[PDB]
Enzyme design. Sequence first.
Site, short mmCIF file in Angstrom:
data_model
loop_
_atom_site.label_atom_id
_atom_site.label_comp_id
_atom_site.label_asym_id
_atom_site.label_seq_id
_atom_site.Cartn_x
_atom_site.Cartn_y
_atom_site.Cartn_z
N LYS A 117 27.09 39.43 44.20
CA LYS A 117 27.13 39.78 43.32
C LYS A 117 26.31 41.43 42.34
O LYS A 117 27.29 42.25 42.32
CB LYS A 117 27.60 39.25 42.01
CG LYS A 117 28.56 38.36 42.53
CD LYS A 117 29.77 38.86 43.61
CE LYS A 117 31.21 38.12 43.60
NZ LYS A 117 32.54 38.41 44.54
N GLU A 124 36.15 40.73 35.14
CA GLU A 124 36.85 39.31 35.16
C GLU A 124 36.32 38.79 36.09
O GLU A 124 35.31 38.57 37.38
CB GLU A 124 38.03 39.39 35.81
CG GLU A 124 37.89 39.34 37.74
CD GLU A 124 37.34 40.72 38.26
OE1 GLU A 124 37.04 42.20 37.49
OE2 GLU A 124 36.78 40.34 39.03
N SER A 157 25.72 34.64 50.85
CA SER A 157 25.79 35.15 50.06
C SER A 157 25.53 34.32 48.62
O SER A 157 24.97 35.26 47.71
CB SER A 157 26.98 35.17 49.90
OG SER A 157 28.21 34.29 49.68
C1 PLS Z 1 28.30 32.88 46.29
C2 PLS Z 1 29.08 33.40 46.26
N1 PLS Z 1 29.96 34.01 47.42
C3 PLS Z 1 31.11 34.26 47.66
C4 PLS Z 1 31.85 34.99 46.92
C5 PLS Z 1 33.21 34.97 46.70
O1 PLS Z 1 33.72 36.75 47.41
P1 PLS Z 1 33.36 37.56 47.86
O2 PLS Z 1 34.36 37.26 49.28
O3 PLS Z 1 33.53 39.08 46.87
O4 PLS Z 1 32.36 38.04 48.64
C6 PLS Z 1 31.88 34.53 45.12
C7 PLS Z 1 32.54 34.72 44.79
N2 PLS Z 1 32.95 34.42 42.71
C8 PLS Z 1 33.70 35.39 41.91
C9 PLS Z 1 34.79 34.80 42.11
O5 PLS Z 1 34.80 32.66 41.63
C10 PLS Z 1 33.24 35.43 40.88
O6 PLS Z 1 33.81 35.33 39.66
O7 PLS Z 1 31.85 34.93 39.93
C11 PLS Z 1 30.15 34.33 45.11
O8 PLS Z 1 30.14 34.23 44.03
#
Ligand code: PLS
Lengths: 257, 257, 390, 390
Positions: free
Chosen positions: C86, C108, C376
């Site tokens: 992220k 959000e 991730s």
């Molecule tokens: C480690 C990790 N891997 C995968 C995802 C999934 O999102 P992505 O499909 O956009 O990569 C998230 C998402 N998290 C979102 C939704 O809950 C948030 O607001 O923090 C994550 O924190």
Amino acid sequence: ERYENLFAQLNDRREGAFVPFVTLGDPGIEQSLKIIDTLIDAGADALELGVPFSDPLADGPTIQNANLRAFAAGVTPAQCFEMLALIREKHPTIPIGLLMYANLVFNNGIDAFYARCEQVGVDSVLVADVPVEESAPFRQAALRHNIAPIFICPPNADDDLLRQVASYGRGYTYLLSRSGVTGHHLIEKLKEYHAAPALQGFGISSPEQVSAAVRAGAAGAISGSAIVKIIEKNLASPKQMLAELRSFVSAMKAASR
Amino acid sequence: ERYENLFAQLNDRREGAFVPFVTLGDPGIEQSLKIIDTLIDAGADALELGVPFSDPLADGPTIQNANLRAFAAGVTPAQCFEMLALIREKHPTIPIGLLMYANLVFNNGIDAFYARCEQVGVDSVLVADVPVEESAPFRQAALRHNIAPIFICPPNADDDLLRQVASYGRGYTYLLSRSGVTGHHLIEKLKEYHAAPALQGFGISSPEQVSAAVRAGAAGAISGSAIVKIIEKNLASPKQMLAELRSFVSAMKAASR
Amino acid sequence: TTLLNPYFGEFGGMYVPQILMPALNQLEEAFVRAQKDPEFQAQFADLLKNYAGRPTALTKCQNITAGTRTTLYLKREDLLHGGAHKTNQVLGQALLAKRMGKSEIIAETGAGQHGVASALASALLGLKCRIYMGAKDVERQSPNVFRMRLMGAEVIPVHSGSATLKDACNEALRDWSGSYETAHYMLGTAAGPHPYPTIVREFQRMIGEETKAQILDKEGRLPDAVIACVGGGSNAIGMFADFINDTSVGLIGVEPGGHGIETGEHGAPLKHGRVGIYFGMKAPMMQTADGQIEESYSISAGLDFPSVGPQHAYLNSIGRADYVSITDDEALEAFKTLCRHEGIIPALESSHALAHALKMMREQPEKEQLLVVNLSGRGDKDIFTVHDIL
Amino acid sequence: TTLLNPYFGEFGGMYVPQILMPALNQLEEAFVRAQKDPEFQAQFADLLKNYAGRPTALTKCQNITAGTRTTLYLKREDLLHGGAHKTNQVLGQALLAKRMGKSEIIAETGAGQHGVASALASALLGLKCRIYMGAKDVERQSPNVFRMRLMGAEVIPVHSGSATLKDACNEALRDWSGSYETAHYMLGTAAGPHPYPTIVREFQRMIGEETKAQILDKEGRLPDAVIACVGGGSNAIGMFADFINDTSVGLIGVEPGGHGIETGEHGAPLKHGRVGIYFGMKAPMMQTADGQIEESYSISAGLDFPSVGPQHAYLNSIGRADYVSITDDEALEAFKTLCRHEGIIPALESSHALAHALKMMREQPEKEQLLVVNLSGRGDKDIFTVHDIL
Ligand SMILES: Cc1ncc(COP(=O)(O)O)c(CN[C@@H](CO)C(=O)O)c1O
Ligand SMILES: Cc1ncc(COP(=O)(O)O)c(CN[C@@H](CO)C(=O)O)c1O
Ligand SMILES: O=P(O)(O)OCCNS(=O)(=O)c1ccc2ccccc2c1
Ligand SMILES: O=P(O)(O)OCCNS(=O)(=O)c1ccc2ccccc2c1
Ligand code: NA
Ligand code: NA
């Protein structure tokens, strides 16, 4: 059709139109039908009816709760169309517009949705989350079924948009009073471009606002939250609810004459 | 001095030495003094007394708890030296060895520590966490004050170590029965190098082990945990504690004759 | 009209109220200009390298594949500042906001990871950050909520609707519809109205770019397949992007199967949902037969977005990428296995991607294959959840 | 006799029972040989780079020093796999254990960070890991305890003594005294008997080596001072080592001042303790007037080692390095400040080093100075502690 006749009639009386908004099924199917009849008997020139949706991302807290209350009653789109047929069977001339969110229109087919609107007697459909940019299939389906597709003219709308809204819109042009969610120069240019009569919406909650809009050149005004608020504070008092709604609507409409 | 006389006497009787170990002040100053007197009256040829230390990293659970019990009684090094003076005033010939941890020796000065040992009548000092490699200042201070510095001969000791232990040690050579913490060939080589008489320690808890050590060539055996265990299971019974300790020690010593 | 195509085949678009179109147009123009600005790219690269810690390692598993002909590498986004991928795109979006002269940030979050990323970026770059989070999620993510506030962010609980991610998404758009003049909406995944699916992909593209360079250096060839979990689609499209034109490289996205697809309690709209229009885009989603939007269920809070990025729906439609699902139990087993055999604690989200790689390996142990799983994020945040279950 | 000097001036040595000397001699010889083995160095470098994530970034603070003539950089060990500098040397020691043919690992831990590092390294390299931890610490570190078990490590509570770090240290040595034939003792800091202070320094030296290369590249000169917290001394000596011969570079170590030096509730033995002999070394320590070993108090569990590495006591004695203390409140303020102004959550241990840098800056705001603070670890682990206090 019904909008064209209404505005032609109102123009002959030098009066503006007052159009209230409510969520179908709020707080219940029976009470909603009674609320709607009271609005009409109080002086409503037209109606704006919302079909309960899970994610009304264009509405403020007032309407948000209106949708929630309706869902608490198990109100569905199918039941809304049954309500709409009944309302039209009782009131043959009042223009009826629906406030929809795209997914409810797209769900079973866009063309099919507008066809259903035409069969129950709906006059217009405003899809809250469909900008002119994505409007093609919706406006086309609307026209094929004699339904007026409602377009939104924002306060910071440029000439390009004004022309599009004036050319694509029907029934009435929605004039946004401000940015955000529910809770003079543009008017003249709309008339220059032969746009459908303008109805100002958002923030309209007092008689003087209705008179100001009409004097500004608008064909009328729409009020929602102000109406829904009367419902949300009289749930335990059905009768008084209707009584207060009547006093409110009668006051707003009087301001349009 | 006292060790040399003891072994000379024991040799004349063709018997080995039995040396029990206890923590000074466990479970209390009074009971500890009584425990010590019982050990001597039961047949102890010498004593190994530990001064309560916060971190006995060379002792198993048994002694760990012995130290803990002593601390519960507020036993300090100063009080231990008072106990030692009293013990010597009562028993003039029994060899008394202390089991120390380096910090207690280094705390107020190494030389000063051995000087205090000499003044109260202590005969030897074994510093558990001081290997031959760091022994210089400790053995030197010991010799200057007529105190025997006790060295440890591990089971896997090489010739080099054997020679050092034999040359630096005094009083008696500590023969480790195994690796780990408290809970034949080396013996012969020690004698070849004129090392102080060997006393086997660690794991000695039965009469036959005492007899085995003596027959192997050792001058005697040391027993700690086995002794402390008798204390830890008779706390609520002071008298019986002394009675059981006496029976145990008398049995162990008999095995050395 | 727009500068870039808002659609990926039939998916995508700009389904937002008329009032929000100016904001989207402005953002698209700012993005296009920034992408051609060497100064912007240099600032973004500097932050990624010296602040976030890029490049992240590409770790070869040396124990988990023993006895098979599978060679597995893990792209270590778990080592990025923040603990998840992220962070990459929030730094980019924060720079865009400043480029447009915006001083406020709206975000959000569901699991709170994007919320934390948004807060840390805003703290570093001097932006006033307000975060919308469903009340239910705020209750289940107290740690992340406190981290956001510690970093100066304003966390706002959303009690409307189901009180979860989708509801927070609505509130964000409601807020932005009347504040876009001074505030930028930092969307957290490769979904929503154009230009977001495009912007988020380009600001996460370095994951795949690095992976390609690293795998070529280490193996002298491209992987047989790159695998990534799919919540909204950002980490997956970030890994996929640079490989799309490499036809020999398989692109596998893993949606959460929850308690099992047949139970209806899952979060796999791409393969088991129905196309709809919501959150500004036309894409497959979790919805009732009537058209009401539903929530996505998964043991992992991060795979809670009830729809999926339009580019993924497009890549699936043309057969370029393949999508599968992994259940709560399969993800849990992958989580435990990586901890014990590689000493890496994976996020439960990422564990879904790992679980599928493990299946590819175990089902055909003598099949020679070079796989890369996008890790991730780290799973220190999931320790309690895994603990209670076990 | 030994191959290397066991002393740093008067400090250090090998004060362990005679039975443990063979183990120390073997370890020293294995270490010396490994240090001359290109193959060993290559394996260690590969793990550091591709598994742990080295090199770590050197981050320039752009907000915390505004209004002053101080330029502050943070060496990002918080981004290393595991979340702290501990990971560096455990990888090295794990390789040494395998070089000697050992299959088991013994480790002690207080805060649990080294425990987690030991467990992850053992899981990766196939070593049977058993960890000793004071019962009091096990109670206060449930998360870390679960992480160790998840990674296959055996955690053993120590109820003897004060049931804390020093007691765990004793148990480790007790165990090793009878198992050194097949088990290696992975000591967690730059203390204990020789060769540990030396080995840990050399296996943490890359922190300083990288910092030097990075600061020269970014500023074209060496820093005026490098600052690091001092619990046992490993992260600090890791940062200091490569700069010792650069006389112009100040070396500042920060011990925990707890509730205040005058209250007696602190963990600053180097400057406020007394030299003693314990845990196999002669060094300054927390001890009673009688010579009984005491515990170190600090808001941060990681600065709990009741003594300090001998090389630090030596560097202080000759005036090469300077040592100071920072109180719980000063560390807490530094923690909050970094979170809000840089978007980085620092470990409370590391916050002590940051707090002193902030003081150097604030006390003389117009003094031009280039400082580097070793951010030894991330503080996600301290979120609850900071929360309850606040
Ligand atoms: C480690 C990790 N891997 C995968 C995802 C999934 O999102 P992505 O499909 O956009 O990569 C998230 C998402 N998290 C979102 C939704 O809950 C948030 O607001 O923090 C994550 O924190
Ligand atoms: C982030 C961080 N920074 C600093 C230190 C202090 O040790 P050091 O002085 O050896 O560097 C620790 C130590 N932690 C020790 C003692 O509690 C452990 O067993 O995990 C740490 O975890
Ligand atoms: O008094 P209020 O609640 O502020 O406003 C009345 C809104 N009702 S409405 O006319 O049905 C209505 C509802 C939402 C909309 C989204 C964007 C375009 C226009 C819209 C029209
Ligand atoms: O029966 P036990 O308890 O196993 O062993 C008896 C130990 N008591 S002792 O002799 O005072 C003793 C205590 C600890 C030591 C550390 C290492 C060198 C030798 C030592 C001698
Ligand atoms: Na999804
Ligand atoms: Na210390």
